[PDB]
Write a protein that binds this DNA or RNA. Structure first.
Ligand SMILES: Nc1ncnc2c1ncn2[C@@H]1O[C@H](COP(=O)(O)OP(=O)(O)OP(=O)(O)O)[C@@H](O)[C@H]1O
Ligand SMILES: Nc1ncnc2c1ncn2[C@@H]1O[C@H](COP(=O)(O)OP(=O)(O)OP(=O)(O)O)[C@@H](O)[C@H]1O
Ligand SMILES: Nc1ncnc2c1ncn2[C@@H]1O[C@H](COP(=O)(O)OP(=O)(O)O)[C@@H](O)[C@H]1O
Ligand SMILES: Nc1ncnc2c1ncn2[C@@H]1O[C@H](COP(=O)(O)OP(=O)(O)O)[C@@H](O)[C@H]1O
Ligand SMILES: [Mg+2]
Ligand SMILES: [Mg+2]
Ligand SMILES: [Mg+2]
Ligand SMILES: [Zn+2]
Lengths: 442, 229, 474, 322
DNA sequence: GCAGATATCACTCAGCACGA
DNA sequence: TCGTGCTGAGTGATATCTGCTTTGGGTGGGTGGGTGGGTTGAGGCAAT
């Protein structure tokens, strides 16, 4: 038995949703889980209930739907692909600069912030989790923290990746709590034994957990995410249901600096109220800066106005509509969005790139130089966590080409990404020296 | 159900089982078992509650192994090999490795007829900057030891550690339920993030390690539990 | 009789009680005459009820049709009466040694239903009845201990043409202003201007219903800030007695939520309800605050909306509604130092944000100067305790009649000089539109005192005279 | 047919814009800019969804800051008493919940459910806040997603959901101290930080400047209100006519002209240059703000294309705040 | 052992037809 | 013209019978007792 409730969007403005109880017989049990949108076709039956008559005071009959078929809510699923499509993906991957097209085709409606696009694409593609004889576990998820000035197209990118990602959960810092991020306990109406619900992090396992207005969350809730960030598991102890739950999901967080703006002079430590541990746990830290420049502002204004005019509601019949929609989509995206959505799923499912052989000394030298130049006061020490992130980003980049050999180009590009992310976070005074020293990598 | 077989986004399902006569007191919580029994239903619209009637238990848990262990002890570099096996994947920190080995083996118990029995167990403190593999060391210590509990200080609370006085719902009687230390009696408890743990829980842990017997005996009951850990 | 002196001897006898109402159940329908209809011949008959028992018939009363056990009760055609159950708590005085006061249940029927509200002192005459309690629902078995209650037969909650002819005589008196100002607070000595200002608050301005906009309310707010030993709290208590509604809230003894409204739940009905705070409970009265300075600015922010819109809007935890708080505010404050120093300006001596002081219609300043004659006369006046004044009973009727019937309307002569007065006030320089609205309200209020339907030049002149001489004419 | 005739007669007039501006908030005296802002807020702007799937806001937010004793709350009360859908809330009384989605246990139920709030009952409508400053910081950040994203996401006890609140919010605020300081900047006068200010479409500072003639006019008008009751108030258009005309305009969906696009780019460049190397008061939002204001102004005239004159007027409205 | 809802059996009464 | 013995019919009292709990919740208690059971989570408000 499941409880079906009306979709919040369908409900007229500020009215109570209406719910019924659906009975699933053999061959239909365990076909849906809480938090799904479904369509139920069945027989609407009624029966005499003494309790209802005693309570209401009139001869009213209980009603329930005896399910005959359940479906999820184009077709059945966009993420599903066919053998014919799998041949198209291999052809596309053969493109010499497919990675650049993937990055460009991501959030085309947003003009700038190419570093954001690179980082978020890497996070979406994900890494390859690794285990060593059951003694050492390495996370494969990639965490990205977005920080910058108020108007910079931050929340919109998270909203986009919510749609693009296979299994994604969107939560806001203000509207969240630890109980809703880990699990909630209910009482089973049949067995009368306490069961345990799934949380926001649990619902997004093997997916992405997007958090907006991250800095606004309370300390306890921000601690609730420490475990999922690194331990990749959430422990619960309520009502004698002690157990451990699986939570292996990547986290993309957006926040604005403390005080409302990023003082380029001061370091990232004082700018944001997050503690040093959580800041370290993040792989790529794409700091966003909103300065003033005539040419850049001209280009931005032109692009924004063109985007607004292009999306005006006024600007077979269904086939013609699809054709014009494709015209616009190709207008702003070198690759159609529909193909990219299936591409992400196929890459995350079938391809697990591995490092066969590559000149370690390159990344070792980069690590040594990072440590040499990071001793300066005001710069967080470059711990091995950066070296791990380099490898993770390299694996993700190789996943873009659907190639199981991590070539040199991908490793150098990952080095560039990590080095730029570290350099931008530091103060101006140290920024000058860091930019001077690092030339080959960037 | 085994964690591996749980489908993604779903939750582990439980099943009640019954054993009689010489099949009782054969397992303890946390042990992987293989069960051969009858899948029957007992009445508690027209539904029934499933359960299993056990007929055979085979848990994954002599002299030959004694000979092998004795030969191993005869190796002239036993200390070095044992210190090498401690966290093979973490570089450096040799002193911490040796200290963790000592903690794993522990110290001999001391008991005096008067009543003052000295402690024998060993505790260690790792206090360094982030990115140092302290958590990895703690995980390996948890896995290697025959009995171990890995607990995050902030994730749990005073109830999680030591013990907490609760009430039995079915019978409505105040009872005592042990914490991580109680469940870790005779083993090792790896506490992570000592800082974020609340001060009251820290003093509770202070007492627990001071006496190794969590003294919560009040509120309708006067029972005490041992926490040798 | 006392609630703690009712013995078994006094069962089934007429007694007299007094107490405080604690809670009353909703209306309960009590059957009086039953209605039966024969299922076969559709014949209808009505039968009476005796001692809570229906004298049901065994078979149809008709001769041709005599089918037994064929009669059925038509629930919606039987005559019904009104029943209600009240709980009475004995007065706090009767408590011998400070324990939980006892309570006695009461039953009222027909007219007396909905006659006493919760939290009222009443005197009830009724029969001290006794009734058994059934041990269980499904048996005739009865407990040996009987329940005691009172069957109420009477309840008493504890203008003539002659009075109107009498009231109209006072209004003709030339020195009416002085008479009322001297009778409002008989004891206070030589505070005629403060008394006059206080009196005009009781009468209030004129009410205006106004579509194409919002309602305009003639409520006056007065601030009494000055040196400590002067009679400030005494006047607060004196006015608190006169007004029909009001709450004596103090400083640091009230909360932001406590003043406006508190969200709670009703245990009996298990529904989300909201209580009335001090300001809401004073709707139509005059609120009183003692220590305004000794109040956190977080709570003071509540008063911003009360004095401006005469309403409070709450939106939290699923409750989104507005409660009317059409009440007058009378607050007092003390100087930062041990006394008031004339040298420094007003905004420094009294605390409070400068903008807040502008909201108040009148802001008085009473200081205890030292003199060889003022102190002598005051001492002779406060020591006699060990120039006639109207009795309070008649004064309350006077103010009630004036507040209900009279409704002044401004005249052209009033406007012609009100524009002049406001522009002159602004020219000498704090002075904002609120001062002009205060002048309008005060002119309307003073006209109410003399029972006139038109505001004259003299009344507005008196209003402006009062305003300049409150802050004080250095 | 008769109402249609009246509507077309309304449109035919070439002085419609100032007529509507004068009619709005008839009780208040001569505040043309604030009335224009309220009108443009009521009309609203076109909301669009790109080929992406990301939604561009189409509602307008206005905050009126002024010294106490000024005519701030009068505008809010008028809007509450005129708008089709709207609610009134106070800064101190309001809380994080009630102003947003709230989770309360179901009546006669053990299960939690979402209870609407102020920003939910005002869907596709105007919400009014009287004392923005007095609101706590915890509650202020509650309305951050509803202002721009136009959606409310809550992840509380087993209630994972994403509601929608497409509401326009209009608020009145007092200065940090008692009176507006001329020397200090807007951000200096208000305790509100950069994000909230950037979110707001317009800012209308009202100063109680002293002048003999306007003082006499205001005194005469306010006394006339109390003497003549309602007949002293003579809006050009009655309330019913105004609510019919507004309803007619909202159906139109203007579009941008090429020259208008270039002119808008130029004006955005001018604003960014004026702010000058960071921009505290001007963000990318302000371009969309000008677009929305121009579309609303075009709606006011009942036209389906935005000429450069509307863009210039919108720029004048925006520049005034700085 | 105790109260309440239910169904069983036995006894006595008003009508009927015939005979006095 | 009429008197009385036989019959069907219908209550009255009495025979067996089920039931003797029942129930989630603190204005039902704990001298009714746990083998009759009760295992939250958000939001508001005083203290500070
Ligand atoms: N580079 C850009 N290209 C296009 N539009 C942009 C760009 N930068 C900002 N914008 C616009 O700026 C507006 C800002 O709203 P958005 O939801 O993107 O985030 P935000 O509210 O400014 O973020 P924050 O949470 O940091 O306050 C959006 O309409 C977005 O379209
Ligand atoms: N010598 C080392 N060999 C391998 N990994 C190391 C070494 N030193 C540090 N690490 C790093 O330790 C990480 C896991 O431990 P972690 O850094 O979480 O411990 P921690 O410093 O206690 O963490 P935190 O202080 O952030 O809570 C690995 O990702 C890893 O590469
Ligand atoms: N003018 C006056 N008339 C009557 N009593 C006065 C006067 N001035 C002072 N008093 C006496 O002095 C005391 C002042 O106390 P109180 O009124 O409580 O001062 P406050 O309330 O301002 O602290 C009163 O009890 C009152 O009897
Ligand atoms: N221009 C005006 N027209 C009409 N009434 C006005 C005007 N200016 C001020 N007022 C009156 O002055 C009073 C004080 O304004 P108020 O609503 O307190 O402002 P705020 O919202 O800052 O508190 C209002 O109730 C209003 O009736
Ligand atoms: Mg945002
Ligand atoms: Mg760690
Ligand atoms: Mg006092
Ligand atoms: Zn009948």
């Amino acid at each position: 038995r499941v409880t079906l409730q009306e979709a919040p969007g369908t409900v007229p403005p500020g009215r109570l949703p209406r719910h019924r109880e659906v009975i699933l017989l053999a061959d239909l049990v365990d076909v849906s889980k809480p938090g799904e949108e479904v369509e139920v076709t069945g027989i609407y039956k009624n029966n005499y209930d003494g309790n209802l008559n005693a309570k209401n005071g009139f001869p009213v009959f209980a009603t329930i739907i005896e399910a005959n078929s359940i479906k999820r809510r184009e077709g059945l699923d966009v993420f599903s692909w066919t053998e014919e499509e799998e041949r198209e993906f291999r052809k596309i991957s053969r493109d010499r600069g497919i990675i650049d097209k993937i990055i460009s085709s991501m959030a085309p409606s947003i003009y700038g912030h190419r570093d954001i696009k690179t980082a978020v694409a890497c996070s979406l593609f994900g890494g390859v989790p690794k285990n060593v004889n059951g003694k050492h576990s390495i996370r494969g998820d990639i965490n990205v923290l977005l920080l910058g000035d108020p108007g910079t197209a931050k929340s919109q990118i998270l909203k986009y990746v919510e749609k693009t990602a296979h299994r994604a959960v969107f939560a806001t810092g203000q509207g969240a709590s630890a109980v809703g991020l880990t699990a909630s306990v209910r009482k089973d109406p049949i067995t009368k034994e306490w069961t345990l619900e799934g949380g926001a992090l649990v619902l997004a396992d093997k997916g992405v957990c997007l958090i907006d207005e991250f800095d606004k969350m309370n300390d306890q809730d921000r601690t609730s995410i420490h475990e999922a960030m690194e331990q990749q598991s959430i422990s619960i102890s309520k009502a004698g249901i002690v157990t451990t739950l699986q939570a292996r999901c990547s986290i993309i967080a957006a926040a604005n600096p403390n005080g409302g703006r990023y003082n380029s002079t001061l370091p990232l430590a004082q700018n944001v109220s997050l503690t040093e541990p959580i800041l370290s746990r993040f792989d790529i830290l794409c700091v966003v800066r909103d300065l003033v420049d005539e040419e850049a502002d001209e280009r931005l204004a032109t692009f924004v106005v063109d985007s607004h005019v292009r999306s005006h509601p006024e600007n077979n019949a269904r086939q013609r509509r699809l054709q014009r929609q494709r015209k616009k989509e190709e207008e702003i995206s070198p690759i159609p969005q529909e193909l990219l959505m299936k591409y992400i799923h196929y890459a995350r499912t079938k391809i697990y790139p591995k490092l066969h052989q590559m000149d370690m000394d390159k990344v070792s030298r980069v690590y040594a130089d990072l440590r040499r130049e990071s001793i300066s006061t005001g710069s967080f020490p470059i711990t091995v966590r950066h070296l791990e992130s380099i490898l993770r980003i390299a694996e993700s980049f190789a996943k873009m080409r659907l190639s199981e050999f991590v070539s040199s180009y991908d490793l150098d590009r990952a080095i560039k990404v990590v080095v730029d992310s570290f350099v931008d976070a530091q103060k101006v005074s140290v920024r000058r020296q860091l930019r001077r020293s690092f030339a080959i990598y960037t | 159900e085994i964690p591996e077989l749980v489908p993604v986004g779903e939750m582990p399902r439980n099943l009640t089982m019954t054993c009689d006569r010489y099949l009782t007191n054969k397992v303890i919580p946390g042990t992987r078992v293989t069960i051969v029994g009858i899948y029957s239903i007992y009445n508690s619209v027209a539904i029934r509650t499933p359960y299993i009637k056990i007929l055979g238990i085979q848990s994954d848990v002599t002299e030959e192994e004694e000979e092998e262990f004795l030969q191993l002890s005869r190796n002239p570099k036993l200390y070095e090999i044992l210190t090498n096996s401690i966290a093979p994947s973490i570089f450096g920190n040799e002193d911490i490795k040796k200290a963790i080995v000592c903690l794993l083996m522990g110290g001999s118990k001391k008991i005096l007829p008067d009543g003052m029995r000295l402690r024998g167990d060993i505790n260690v403190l790792l206090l360094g900057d982030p990115g140092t593999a302290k958590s990895q060391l703690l995980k390996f210590v948890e896995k290697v030891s025959p009995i171990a509990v890995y607990t995050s200080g902030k994730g749990s609370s005073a109830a999680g550690l030591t013990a907490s006085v609760q009430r039995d719902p079915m019978t409505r009687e105040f009872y005592l339920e042990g914490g991580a230390m109680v469940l870790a009696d005779g083993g090792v408890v790896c506490i992570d993030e000592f800082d974020k743990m609340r001060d009251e829980d820290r003093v509770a842990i202070h007492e627990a390690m001071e006496q190794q017997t969590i003294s919560i005996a009040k509120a309708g009951i006067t029972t005490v539990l041992n926490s040798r850990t | 009789k006392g609630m703690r002196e009712l013995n078994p001897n006094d069962i089934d006898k007429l007694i007299n009680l007094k107490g405080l109402v604690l809670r009353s159940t909703p209306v309960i329908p009590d059957m009086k005459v039953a209605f039966f209809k024969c299922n076969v011949c559709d014949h209808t008959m009505a039968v009476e009820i005796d001692r809570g028992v229906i004298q049901e018939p065994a078979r149809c009363e008709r001769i041709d049709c005599n089918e037994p056990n064929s009669m059925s009760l038509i629930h919606n055609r039987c005559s019904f009466a009104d029943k209600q159950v009240i709980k009475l708590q004995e007065t706090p005085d009767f408590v011998p040694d400070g324990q939980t006061p006892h309570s006695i249940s009461l039953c009222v029927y027909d007219e007396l239903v909905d006659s006493c509200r919760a939290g009222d002192r009443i005197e009830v005459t009724g029969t001290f009845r006794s009734i058994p309690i059934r041990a269980n629902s499904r048996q005739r078995v009865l407990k040996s201990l009987y329940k005691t209650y009172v069957d109420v037969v009477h309840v008493k909650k504890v203008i003539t043409d002659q009075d109107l002819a009498k009231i109209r005589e006072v209004a003709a008196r030339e020195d009416l202003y002085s008479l009322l100002a001297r009778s409002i607070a008989p004891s206070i000595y030589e505070l005629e201007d403060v008394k006059k200002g206080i009196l005009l608050q009781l009468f209030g301005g004129t009410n205006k219903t106004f579509t194409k906009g919002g309602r305009y309310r003639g409520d006056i707010n007065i601030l009494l800030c000055g040196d400590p030993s002067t009679s400030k709290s005494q006047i607060l208590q004196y006015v608190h007695k006169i007004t029909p509604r009001g709450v004596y809230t103090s400083g640091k003894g009230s909360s932001a939520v406590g003043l406006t409204a508190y969200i709670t739940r009703d245990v009996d009905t298990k529904q989300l309800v909201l209580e009335s705070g001090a300001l809401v409970l004073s709707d139509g009265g005059v609120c009183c605050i003692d220590e305004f300075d000794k109040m956190s600015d977080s709570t003071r922010s509540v008063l911003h909306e009360v004095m401006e819109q005469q309403t409070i809007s709450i939106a939290k935890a699923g409750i989104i509604t507005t409660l009317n708080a059409r009440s007058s505010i009378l607050a007092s404050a003390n100087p930062i130092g041990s006394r008031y120093n004339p040298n420094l300006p007003v905004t420094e001596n009294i605390d409070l944000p400068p903008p807040l002081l502008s909201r108040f219609d009148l802001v008085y300043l009473v200081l205890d100067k030292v003199d060889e004659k003022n102190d002598r006369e005051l001492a002779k006046h406060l020591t006699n305790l060990y120039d006639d004044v109207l009795p309070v009973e008649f004064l309350t009727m006077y103010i009630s009649y004036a507040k209900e019937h009279i409704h002044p309307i401004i005249t052209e002569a009033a406007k012609t000089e009100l524009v002049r007065a406001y522009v002159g006030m602004r020219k000498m320089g704090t002075a904002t539109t609120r001062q002009l609205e205060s002048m309008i309200r005060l002119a309307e209020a003073h006209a109410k005192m003399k029972l006139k339907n038109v505001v004259e030049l003299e009344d507005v002149q008196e209003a402006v005279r009062l305003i300049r001489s409150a802050i004080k004419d250095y | 047919s008769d109402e249609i005739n009246e509507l077309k007669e309304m449109v035919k007039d070439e002085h419609i814009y100032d007529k509507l501006v004068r009619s709005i908030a008839p009780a208040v005296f001569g505040h043309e800019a604030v009335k224009k802002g309220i009108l443009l807020q009521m009309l609203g702007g076109v909301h669009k969804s790109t080929v992406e799937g990301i939604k561009l806001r189409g509602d307008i937010n206005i905050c009126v800051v002024g010294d106490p004793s000024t005519s701030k709350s009068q505008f809010l009360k008028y809007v509450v008493g005129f708008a089709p859908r709207s609610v009134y809330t106070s800064g101190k009384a309001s809380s994080a919940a009630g102003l947003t989605a709230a989770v309360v246990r179901d009546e006669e139920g053990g299960d939690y459910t979402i209870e609407a709030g102020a920003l939910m009952l005002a869907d596709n409508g105007i919400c009014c806040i009287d004392e923005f400053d007095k609101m706590d910081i915890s509650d202020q950040v509650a309305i951050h997603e509803a202002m721009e994203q136009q959606t409310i996401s809550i992840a509380k006890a087993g209630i994972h959901a994403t509601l929608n609140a497409r509401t326009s919010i209009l608020a009145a605020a007092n200065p940090v101290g008692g009176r507006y300081n001329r020397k200090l900047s807007l951000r200096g006068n208000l305790n509100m930080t950069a994000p909230i200010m950037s979110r707001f479409d317009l800012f209308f500072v009202i100063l109680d400047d002293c002048n003999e003639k306007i003082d006499t006019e205001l005194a005469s008008h306010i006394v006339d209100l109390h003497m003549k009751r309602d007949e002293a108030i003579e809006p050009p258009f009655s309330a019913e006519q105004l609510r019919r005309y507004i309803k007619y305009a909202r159906t139109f969906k203007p579009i941008l002209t090429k020259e208008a696009r270039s002119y808008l780019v130029e004006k955005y460049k001018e604003l960014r240059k004026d702010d000058a190397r960071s921009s505290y008061r001007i963000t990318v939002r302000q371009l969309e703000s000008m677009i929305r204001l121009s579309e609303a102004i075009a709606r006011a005239n009942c036209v389906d294309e935005i000429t450069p004159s509307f863009i210039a007027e919108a720029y004048d409205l925006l520049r005034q705040s700085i």
